[PDB]
Amino acid sequence: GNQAGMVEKFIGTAYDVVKTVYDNLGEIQFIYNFLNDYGVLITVDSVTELQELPTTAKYTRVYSS
Amino acid sequence: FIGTAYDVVKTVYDNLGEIQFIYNFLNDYGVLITVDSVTELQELPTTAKYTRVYSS
Amino acid sequence: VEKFIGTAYDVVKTVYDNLGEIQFIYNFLNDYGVLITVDSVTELQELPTTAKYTRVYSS
Amino acid sequence: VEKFIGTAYDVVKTVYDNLGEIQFIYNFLNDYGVLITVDSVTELQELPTTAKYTRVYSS
Amino acid sequence: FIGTAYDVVKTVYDNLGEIQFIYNFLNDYGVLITVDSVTELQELPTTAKYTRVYSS
Amino acid sequence: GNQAGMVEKFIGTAYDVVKTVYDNLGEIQFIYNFLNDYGVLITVDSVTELQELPTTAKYTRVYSS
Amino acid sequence: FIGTAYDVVKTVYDNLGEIQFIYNFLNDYGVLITVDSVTELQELPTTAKYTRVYSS
Amino acid sequence: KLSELFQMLSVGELSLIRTGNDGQGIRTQDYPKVIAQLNAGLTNLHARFPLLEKEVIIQQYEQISKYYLRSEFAQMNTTSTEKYKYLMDSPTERFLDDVIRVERVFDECGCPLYLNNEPCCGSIVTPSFDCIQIVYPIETNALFVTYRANHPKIALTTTDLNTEVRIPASHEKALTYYIASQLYSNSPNPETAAKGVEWSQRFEAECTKIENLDLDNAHIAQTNVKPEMRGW
Amino acid sequence: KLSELFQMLSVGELSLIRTGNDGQGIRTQDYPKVIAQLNAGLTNLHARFPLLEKEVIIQQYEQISKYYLRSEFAQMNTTSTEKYKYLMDSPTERFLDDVIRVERVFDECGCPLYLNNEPCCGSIVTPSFDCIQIVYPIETNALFVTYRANHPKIALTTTDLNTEVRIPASHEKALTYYIASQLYSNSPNPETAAKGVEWSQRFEAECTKIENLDLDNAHIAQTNVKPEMRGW
Amino acid sequence: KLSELFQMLSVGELSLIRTGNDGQGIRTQDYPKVIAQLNAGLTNLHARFPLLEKEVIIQQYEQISKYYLRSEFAQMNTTSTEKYKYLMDSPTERFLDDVIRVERVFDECGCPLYLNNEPCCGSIVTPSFDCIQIVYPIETNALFVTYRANHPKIALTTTDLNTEVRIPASHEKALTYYIASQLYSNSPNPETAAKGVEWSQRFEAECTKIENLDLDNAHIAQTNVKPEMRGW
Amino acid sequence: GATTRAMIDILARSANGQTGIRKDMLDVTNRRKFDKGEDYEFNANVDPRQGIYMHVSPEIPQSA
Amino acid sequence: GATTRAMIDILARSANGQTGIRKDMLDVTNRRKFDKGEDYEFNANVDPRQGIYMHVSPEIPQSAPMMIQYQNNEAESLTGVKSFSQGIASQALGDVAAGIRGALDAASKRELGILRRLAQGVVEIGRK
């Protein structure tokens, strides 16, 4: 046996999701890298909390009324 | 030995930590979500309070 | 006695326990996208084409 | 283990899956015909007699 | 070995790509259809909006 | 067995069509060749779409009212 | 030999005298009990007549 | 046809009983009662005799190891929402759930495989009454399960009398005696129960007769190949 | 489906009895009486024949040596307040208390273990009818108990008639005869008791027939490995 | 649960009898009559089959040589005024007088001891049906008697119907047939006595069936150790 | 060679040592006593000369 | 070896000494008297020739010794050495008397065919 029975028993209906994730695994690594370095623009809903963010969050958008 | 399903599962398992970090970062801080059309914007979950749409 | 650490059952069950995170990753990949920001245009180029949303901060 | 690629079942099933295209080809052959156009009369000759519909563009 | 039916099927299978290309080209662009008499023109499917008839 | 059972199981009632196609396979190749080189007169239903056609489509008939 | 449960039980048993002394000292004399918030103060048993709370 | 069977039951066998309507044809309200018994009779005859043996192709997928013999996973059944339909049915062989016993299992090339063999770790095991477990499934393979097949089930609400009952004329009496036995045995009346028992005994005598004559070419001996295998 | 079974019981077998309502369908008040008998019939068939064999994973904990085969300790059953749920159930294999006989016991790697063996002090003993005693449990191990499984029990208060009764069409008559025997045997009337006895005998004849034909591929011989073990 | 058993008895088996109340549930006044018969049935099944085997620790005292297997001397039973409670019960194993047969006797370290052996003057003898005589008791020792256990007795005055009857679904019919046999056999009416005898025969047939199938893993063979003992 | 193989097949594929015990012969304690190797005590309705059977290899036919 | 193991399995796994006693044969005192070894006294409804049975090992089938002998006869026919035998082959090396050489049977010639080669080896060593 090639342990396909275990995959069917535990990942029976989510194998499409698992295979799709495995297909884009390189892009998954790329997206993992960007976020790690706060390379994404973090958004806050008000002031006095943009300060609470790590200094590594070089890019921020603040929401105000 | 052709364990294609198990090969896929093990390859995903080797990078499970990246998935955990991505999920934690996206559920902890809150980033800007960009959607192409206005439709999927409505089909977005209400948990994404921040959205941007690109049109022509 | 023998301790079974890292067997096929362990890997499969570890993947199964993290099925919610895998589904979240699938939804993030297929439904919407994130805004990736760089510092210079050179970096925009040094960026993979999968980043269909980019913002550059320049002086 | 052995992978069965290109066996009799594979060929027969591949033909079966494309039965709609084969039927379309049969209908195109038996029912109607297409207009085949060439550039010169020489080419009209260099054309098989199955082309019962021809148009030549000349200056 | 006399596999006449299988010989015919395999000979068709070797040229299946030509059939696929022909079907795709005819369903994608739309060409002029020529019919001998007025009868088969009526028996033509409505998908062929362009027709030409040759008579004497 | 000469694998006739598989042909009957999958091509049982369409064997006439398959044999007729196989009989005219040379003419099938000829018709495949002509179309490939836009050797057929392509027809469009209006203007501003004859331009959308590949430059290889040397022969075109345009329909207008 | 992996007797994890028995190892834990034996490790507790080797220090049972300390637990007995602690219980006897706390039930014999009566010391000051300190609780962080006012809630667990109410959830404290009535046997602790002496309490102190630290707040900001 | 079903009309002929209904007429034969109405006059001659189910005569002195309510369902026969005194020999004037089975009523249009008692159909779901003769049809239920007819399905049981056809199943009994098709399981005790080899009146229909059929094969089904099971395409192996990388993530599936337990393959169920249900039409929900058929290639021709387009009504089902199953993502992967591994049953390979054709307009000729349709696989209408008519499986009575999984006898032999082959591979794509045509080499027989062991069935329900424990010592050999290359055998196709059968967990349940309708499942096929492949411990080693490969995305580029297909099974060739051969089974003894049942008569396509006649629905209880069937009203068209042109539905053909495909049984040889020699088993017509066996089926009719079985139907009479089943319908006569429902009542607890001793006099009627005795007639039901007599019909059951007569059905079991007709089956014994057909077995003794081997009208279906079932119990036929084969060429002996043991000397060749043993190296004589 | 349960609707088909109810109709079949109403007309044909439970006809001349109160529960059949003269062949107009089982009343909505007699459901908890056919269902109780149906559960017993399904249990009898699933215990005497191998119609469903299933496996369950039992995760070993350091402080637990007696593991009970109850859904209260299941991983998917979220209604229970048990601190440690050692049964490892999946959406595919759910372990709905459908255990009839614990046959084989394996380990995480897949090496068979002895069951109920006294001389070998490495065997998994079975104290009670639903317990698994591991004298040597390890926090980093898991069991692979395989058992003969029962039909998911149909609740006595079940009202949805779309609940599917998963039995082969060959055992439909066996189950129906068993239900008739059980319902006919409650009354002490000699005339009705005789009919109940006749139904019991007919059920035991159908079971004997299926055993003789081996419609479930149960009594199949295996490859002999004794010469290899004995060193020939 | 007891409610399910009462309903099953009321409709289906104890139907044409007073205790069944015409299939509308067992009356709240006839409980101490089905419960007395249910205790006997559970005792019969738990004595003829090994449905529950349990161990009890007996702490030895210097002045006591005859140890009685009664809950009055239990460590958890705090209602008794006995000065020395040598039974060592736990919240897990409670020793509710559920002793059917004293099978094996061990010591504190785990070395088996002889039971009822006369020539060996180191064996634990059994004077009465509930006593354990230790001719050589030591104040720093404890016994490890293992016995076949009975179902915790359901009190005759029990009114809560949520008390669970812990028997496998395969023995549900055996217990129900036993209850029917016991309740039908009280009357001296020949017609009812015949039905009681038939129920007794059917119960003894169900027990024979379960013995033949070994649904409780009782009659399982063990590894032969005679060659090792004899020095081969 | 074929006759020698047939003789070995008759002598080997059989059950040399497999001893059957009737299920309803000995109670729980007497079964253990019989397994250990001491004297046992059987019920009044069973016969030791029929309950216990030890299989031996069938004799090779004199023709081989 | 397989046949010997089968014989030992038949003779050993059996019950040699296990004596069964019918349960309803002797009362409490007579059972003790029988166990001690003195005369007993049985009830009128039981027979001593049926109540008491002492098991003995089943007899080994005559086929197993036959196969052992046959496979021990096909070995002495292939090699040539046969258990305790009278041999002249060790006294017939080299130029010997005619009477000694005249008593050479087939087995002795087979055994001499190896002795001559082994002696040729020693002669080749001696020449060196």
Residue numbers in the entry:
A (entry chain E), F (entry chain E): 10 to 74
B (entry chain F), E (entry chain F), G (entry chain F): 19 to 74
C (entry chain D), D (entry chain D): 16 to 74
H (entry chain B), I (entry chain B), J (entry chain B): 2 to 233
K (entry chain A): 387 to 450
L (entry chain A): 387 to 514
Task: Please share text taken word for word from the publication where this structure appeared.
We isolated and characterized two Shigella podophages that have notably different features when compared with classical podophages and instead are most closely related to phage N4. We describe the isolation and characterization of phages Moo19 and B2, including whole-genome sequencing and analysis, cryo–electron microscopy (cryo-EM) structure determination, mass spectrometry, host range studies, and enzymatic assays of the tail proteins. Our work shows that these phages have divergent decoration proteins and unique tail structures, and encode and package their own phage-dependent RNA polymerase, and the tails, which display esterase activity, are dependent on specific O-antigen modifications of lipopolysaccharide (LPS) for entry. Moo19 and B2 are similar to bacteriophage N4—these are all T = 9 podophages, which encapsidate their own polymerases—a hallmark of this phage family.
We were able to clearly model several proteins with our C12-symmetrized maps including most residues for the portal proteins, tail adaptor proteins, and tail tubes for both Moo19 and B2. In addition, we were able to model the N-terminal residues of the tailspike proteins for both Moo19 and B2 but not the full-length proteins using the cryo-EM data as these are likely highly flexible at the linkage site. The portal shown in red was modeled from residues 17 to 675 of 760 total for Moo19 and residues 182 to 679 of 706 total for B2. The adaptor proteins were largely complete with all 234 residues modeled for Moo19 and residues 2 to 233 of 234 total for B2. Last, the tail tube shown in blue was modeled for residues 4 to 278 of 279 for Moo19 and residues 3 to 200 of 206 for B2. The tail tube of Moo19 (gp71) and the tail tube of B2 (gp34) both share a high sequence homology (>80%) with a number of phages that infect enteric hosts such as Shigella, Salmonella, Escherichia, Klebsiella, etc. In addition, Moo19 and B2 have C12 symmetry and not the proposed C15 symmetry of DEV. There is no homolog predicted in the genome, no similar protein seen in the mass spectrometry data, and no corresponding density observed in the B2 reconstruction. In G7C, this appendage is hypothesized to expand the host range; however, Moo19 and B2 have the same host range, so the function of gp81 in Moo19 is unclear at this time. Three major structural differences (see cartoon representation in Fig. 3B) include (i) the lack of the tail appendage, (ii) a single tailspike for Moo19 and a complex of two proteins for B2 (see next two paragraphs), and (iii) the completely different decoration proteins.
